[PDB]
Structure formats: C-alpha cells, structure tokens
C-alpha cells in the first residue's frame, strides 16, 4: 500500500524493491556475493564529514552511477571491475575510497620517518589520459594533504627525477614509463595497498600487456588477499579495510570491453572482484552474462540437468521453441523431482512465492527478475533471444543465460556471436566465435 518512488523514502525505509527500481533508474548492474547497496546521495553516505566537505566544495553535487555502486565496495577493501567509460565519473569512484582510508588512519600510524613510496598507484595507457587523472587527484587530494606525482611521458626527466625525490601518496604513470622507473629503482611500491588499473582494454590495444604484467611482479606479493570465498565476505572484508595500515590492497580495473587479454590481467592482478558495469538498460546482451554450449539435440537433456543438478536461485526460466516441447519437457523434470510450471497469473504467484522454481515456455507477459534463463532451444532470431535473455532484469544482478546451439540453430550463429561479443559481462566462447558458421551475416 506504500506506492512511493524511493526517492521519497529515507534511507532506512529503502525496500529490495526499492533497491531494485534505484538500480534500474541509475542502470547499475552488477555481479559478485553480497553486494553493498549504493549510495543514494552523499548527505545519505556514511562518508566522514571532512570527506564529505572535500566533496561538496569540488562540487561534484550528486554521485554519478559508477562512484553510487563501487564506493561502498571500496570501502570494504574488495576488488571492482568497473565497466565504464571514461567521462562516467570512474576516477573519484576510485579515488574516495583511498582518501577514507589514507587520512583515516592513525597519526602514529601515518608516520614513517624514511620514504617508501606511494599508497596508491594509479595506471592510464595514456599520457593524456593520466594528466587528466592527475589534475582530478590535485584537486580532490591537495586540501586533505594528499600529495601526488605524474611518472609519464611528455614531461623532462630532471623535472620529473626531481619531483620523485620528495616523496608522495599516489603516483599516477603510464605503464612504459613506470617500467623503467621501477627498473631503475627510481621508485618502489613498498606501502601500495592500492592498485588502479584505468582503460585496461586499451593498454592491452597497445600492446602493453608484458609491460603491465611486469608492474605487478614489483609489488610486494604478501598483501594480496587470498583466492577463498573471504575476499567478498563483507564482513571480513570490511574489518579488514578498517584494520588501517595493514590492510590487504584493494585493486581496481576499469575497461570498457573484456576481450581475453583484459580477462588475463584480471585473473592476476584482482582475487574474486565484484562487477560494477553502466548502462545499456535497453540492450540487455550488453549486461547479461552469456554463456553457450554446442551439442547435438540428443545432448539437450542430459545437459540440462547436469546444470540444473549442479543448484540454482529460484525461480529460472527455461525457453523452447514449439509447445509441444513445452509440456513433454516439463514433465520430464517434474519426473526428475523438480517443480515446474508451463506457458497464468497463478502461475507467476507460485513463482513469486518460491512454490515452483522452473517455467518453463516458449517465446509467446509480467514477471520477476530471475537469476537464470536457459535457452533449451536457440532462438530463430536474435531479437526473440535479446527479450528471452532480457528476463534476468532490467539491472542489479547480471544473471546468466545459457543457449545450447545445435547445427539447426546456423543462421542465428554470427548475430549471437555479435550479441556475446558486444557483452562485456560475457567471456568471448571460441567455440561460437571460431565457427565456420558465425563467420558471415545469414543469407
Ligand atoms: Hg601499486
């Protein structure tokens, strides 16, 4: 009977319904366990009140959607991949958490008598880029104390050697530049318990990937968090950032795609990241994790409940392309011990009410977000497969959809092969995209 936008309510009396419509109206998407909500404004934060003085005289007035999602997971010291662009507001997004930390430590803890370093460092593929990185960082670090120094290209070495000699928080270089530097013990990163890496799909377009890998070999490997189920317990995660100084780093990637490369650099440099991905509230192939099995049509069923065996999130939905299939598929799992429906209302109800956990359908109204769709049968066009897939959400959690291709399925292989490789919350499938099939546009 409460009908209010969310934005009528305070904070406390936010529902998961409102969650879900604010992520909806800021199209946030995400994917990682328990996810902190977003921050609804900045008077609504609990950012210190000298941060939210540092803010509010910057004047940066509202939170843009990637600082609303991925402060609130920085501040529990855990690891994004923050899919954005570059004029998303992706730099304060980062740079807020690390000013929390940094001048939320103890006074006797901030001491060290000899120099080692920056907390932070801070990687663009750019010299350009990097100066805008820079001049953001001054602004935001400068009335806190926060000292930063460029280690890039484009500026003389004396100048540059100089200003290394003084001391800093945060570096912000390019990735040739900071190489060197590093060979030559110019620099160490001794107290860094951050890591950014910022455009990383077009570092890899460079061709730095070797230079970016050899970065990371210098970083002291005893602070990285460790690969377990802990690095996204948020209350582990969140005593840990709160530990002050021995902290495990935190490392966050920014990239607009997730070519293979990008995904490499991932699985070294961050331990279980959260996804913060922007956008595309009316192209869910961008947004939805999508995953694809070639098989013949006799592999369908075993295959399904191989999957269904491994446990889902009720409720899913499970498509197919005639109702004939429909009703002998859905008995065959009720057959399985598994509760499903077919396609009305009342249907949806026991959905909704956790009574069924399987719909099963074909592409013929309204329903609930739902953790997995699987495609039993391809679409015949990718328009139908865009609004099947479509049925994870508008936001929030990415969810997964999963299409079992047979050699039928031939003349929708290179638009499904577009769809996945236009979603950067998809791993790209060799499988579909090597085929000599989803080579050229049907007919
Ligand atoms: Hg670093």
């Given at each position: 009977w409460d009908d209010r936008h969310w934005s009528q309510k305070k904070l406390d009396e936010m529902t998961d319904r409102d969650w879900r419509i604010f992520r909806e109206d800021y199209s946030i998407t995400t994917k990682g366990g328990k996810i902190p909500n977003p921050i609804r404004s900045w008077k609504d934060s609990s950012l210190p009140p000298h941060i939210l003085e540092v803010i509010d005289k910057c004047g940066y007035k509202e939170p843009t959607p990637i600082q609303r999602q991925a402060i609130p997971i920085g501040l529990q010291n855990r690891d994004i991949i923050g899919v954005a662009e570059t004029g998303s507001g992706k730099t304060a997004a980062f740079l807020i958490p690390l000013l929390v930390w940094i001048t939320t430590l103890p006074k006797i803890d901030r001491i060290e008598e000899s120099d080692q370093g920056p907390y932070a460092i801070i990687l663009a593929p750019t010299r350009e880029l990097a100066q805008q990185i820079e001049e953001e960082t001054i602004k935001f670090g400068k009335p806190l104390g926060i000292r930063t120094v460029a280690v890039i290209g484009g500026i003389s070495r004396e100048d540059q050697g100089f200003r290394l000699?003084?001391?800093?928080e945060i570096v912000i270089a390019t990735p040739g530049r900071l190489i060197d530097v590093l060979e030559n013990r110019?620099?160490?990163?001794?107290?860094?318990?951050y890591v950014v890496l910022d455009e990383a799909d077009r570092m890899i377009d460079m061709g730095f990937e070797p230079d970016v890998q050899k970065i990371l070999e210098?970083?002291?490997?005893?602070n990285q968090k460790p690969d377990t189920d802990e690095a996204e317990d948020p209350e582990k995660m969140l005593a840990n950032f709160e530990s002050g100084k021995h902290k495990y780093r935190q490392t966050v990637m920014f990239t607009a795609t997730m070519p293979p490369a990008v995904e490499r650099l991932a699985r070294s440099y961050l331990r279980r990241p959260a996804v913060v991905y922007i956008g595309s509230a009316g192209k869910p192939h961008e947004r939805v994790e999508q995953k694809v099995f070639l098989m013949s049509?006799?592999?369908?069923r075993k295959k399904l409940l191989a999957i269904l065996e491994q446990g889902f999130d009720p409720p899913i939905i499970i498509f197919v392309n005639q109702k004939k299939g429909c009703d002998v598929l859905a008995k065959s799992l009720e057959k399985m011990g598994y509760n499903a429906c077919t396609l009305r209302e009342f249907a949806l109800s026991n959905l909704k009410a956790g009574a069924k956990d399987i719909l099963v359908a074909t592409d013929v109204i309204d329903i609930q977000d739902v953790s997995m769709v699987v495609n039993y049968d391809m679409a015949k066009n990718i328009e139908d497969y865009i609004h099947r897939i479509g049925r994870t959400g508008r936001a929030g959690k990415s969810g997964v959809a999963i299409t079992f291709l047979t050699k039928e399925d031939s003349a929708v292989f290179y638009e499904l092969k577009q769809a996945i490789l236009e979603s950067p919350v998809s791993s790209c499938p060799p499988e579909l995209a090597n085929h000599?099939?989803?080579q050229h546009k049907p007919g």
């Open positions: 000699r003084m001391g800093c110019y620099l160490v990163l001794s107290r860094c318990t210098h970083m002291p490997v005893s049509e006799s592999e369908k000599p099939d989803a």
